[PDB]
Design a protein around this ligand. Structure first.
Ligand SMILES: CCCCCCCC/C=C/CCCCCCCC(=O)OC[C@H](COP(=O)(O)OCC[N+](C)(C)C)OC(=O)CCCCCCC/C=C/CCCCCCCC
Lengths: 439, 49
């Protein structure tokens, strides 16, 4: 027998489903999502790192003028300054007081830290959800892990579980993401080979092991100071180091729906969005004939005390008379009230106790022990604690008109107004009939 | 569960107060003022002998 159901995507909140196969005693299954993971497919655009400026020792030409050469190094710059009189420690380096030139030249390269310190600029195409589920089956917790694509059925304890597909395609990653080492950011990095100087992407490379590097750092050479043999230059400072300081908050701290972000691979964990279609196939050997199942009669239910406190703040006591000893399914036929227990032991003529969570200030619901249901109702007090560290176990209060008993005030006022309106309308119609008869 | 109650200031007469809390069986506390003392703050003026 195969069964299908849909559970909210909220992680860590158990849900109960009812498997009412005709001719058999109803079965109740509890499933809880342990973890939900979205792992987008990534394509690496390029890498960024801190650049290094490689400066060969200046060529100072004595009694002559050097000439600028040319080459295709990443940011090669060359400039010949004339009229220099460099000094070394032992005295002047050039024989003549003037007619000297210095051939300053430099380029830039990937550092040696690009093997370790880099930021990868990815392109996140589409997510491949995978969920790990815990289902209470035959009074046993069995942990089932499978992909959430609606396919790839997995089998445990002779049951066949297929889970998914996701009801929502929402993902916390944009098309363009960058990962530093553990953090991921949704930023729109510049195109490869079109990066601005002094900003993230001023130096780019396809892979950290690559050799071809694009670098736009506006390296400008400058005239050496009088009587010195240095090579001064003006360059925009590394944009990757500037980014490291001005990163901002990662996606792990700003993603909505309480998402969690990991790395290698990049994942989004516990997205609290949408719902999870889950389909269960169970062997016929799991079920029991309705006749062989215990039958219950003379059921009365009372609520000694109740509180809508998000943590099963209510208790119900049910008296019963049983035909024979055996396990029985307990299911609440009211979405506004959630019952912790799933199956219960039933024997003889005795009573059983169940705990339920609700948001109604006046609880009114029908608990259905195996094959027989009983009406239950009582008032719920409000809790004293304002804030708690766990989510509400029940569902929302109610989408419509679930106001409490002592709405009898509403009934009374509406009925009185309706009586007055009806009396006025009757008087109007009787006088209208009398006046219309008159002629 | 903080429960504020008021008992008359009479000494030696037991008074029963009801502490009721939903979800828990009601509790009754029997209390009895054994002694009450008032201590004025004195500022001595002078001694006469
Ligand atoms: C001549 C004048 C004519 C003028 C016309 C007036 C028009 C004014 C109104 C416009 C309507 C405003 C609505 C604002 C938008 C809210 C939308 C929303 O987000 O909706 C929240 C939910 C509704 O859910 P849904 O059904 O839409 O979802 C299902 C959605 N779908 C149906 C598409 C599937 O609302 C909930 O659940 C919240 C539940 C909380 C219940 C609060 C109970 C308040 C009771 C007070 C009783 C007072 C005590 C009586 C004492 C009297 C003694 C004498």
């Amino acid at each position: 027998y195969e069964h299908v159901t849909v559970i909210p995507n909220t992680v860590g909140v158990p849900y109960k489903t009812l498997v009412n196969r005709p001719g058999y005693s109803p079965m109740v299954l509890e499933m809880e999502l342990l973890s939900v993971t979205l792992e987008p497919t990534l394509s690496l655009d390029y890498i960024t790192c801190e650049y290094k400026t490689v400066i060969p020792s200046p060529y100072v030409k004595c009694c002559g003028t050097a000439e600028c050469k040319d080459k295709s190094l990443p940011d090669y710059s060359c400039k010949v300054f004339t009229g220099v009189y460099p000094f070394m420690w032992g005295g002047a380096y050039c024989f003549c007081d003037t007619e000297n030139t210095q051939l300053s030249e430099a380029h830039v390269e990937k550092s040696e830290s690009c093997k370790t310190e880099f930021a990868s600029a990815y392109r996140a195409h589409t997510a491949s959800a995978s969920a790990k589920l815990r289902v209470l089956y035959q009074g046993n917790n069995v942990t089932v892990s499978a992909y959430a694509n609606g396919d790839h059925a997995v089998t445990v304890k002779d049951a066949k579980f297929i889970v998914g597909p996701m009801s929502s395609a929402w993902t916390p990653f944009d098309n363009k993401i960058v990962v530093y080492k553990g953090d991921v950011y949704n930023m729109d990095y510049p195109p490869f080979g079109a990066g601005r100087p002094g900003q993230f992407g001023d130096i780019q490379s396809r892979t950290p092991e690559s050799e071809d590097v694009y670098a736009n750092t506006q390296l400008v050479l400058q005239r050496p100071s009088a009587g010195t043999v240095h090579v001064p230059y003006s360059q925009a400072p590394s944009g990757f180091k500037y980014w490291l300081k001005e990163r901002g908050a990662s996606l792990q701290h700003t993603a909505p729906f309480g998402c969690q972000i990991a790395t290698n691979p990049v994942r989004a964990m516990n997205c609290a969005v949408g719902n999870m279609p889950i389909s269960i196939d169970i062997p016929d050997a799991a079920f029991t004939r309705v006749v062989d199942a215990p039958s219950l009669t003379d059921m009365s239910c009372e609520v000694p005390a109740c509180t809508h406190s998000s943590d099963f703040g209510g208790v119900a006591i049910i008296k019963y008379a049983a035909s024979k000893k055996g396990k029985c399914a307990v299911h609440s036929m009211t979405n506004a009230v959630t019952i912790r227990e799933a199956e219960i032991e039933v024997e003889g003529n005795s009573q059983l106790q169940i705990s339920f969570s609700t948001a109604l200030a006046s609880a009114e619901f029908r608990v259905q022990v195996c094959s027989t249901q009983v009406h239950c109702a009582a008032e719920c007090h409000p809790p004293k604690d304002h804030i708690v560290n766990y989510p509400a176990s029940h569902t929302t209060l109610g989408v419509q008109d679930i106001s409490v008993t002592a709405m009898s005030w509403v009934q009374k006022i509406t009925g009185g107004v309706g009586l007055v309106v009806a009396v006025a309308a009757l008087i109007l119609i009787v006088v209208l009939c009398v006046s219309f008869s008159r002629h």
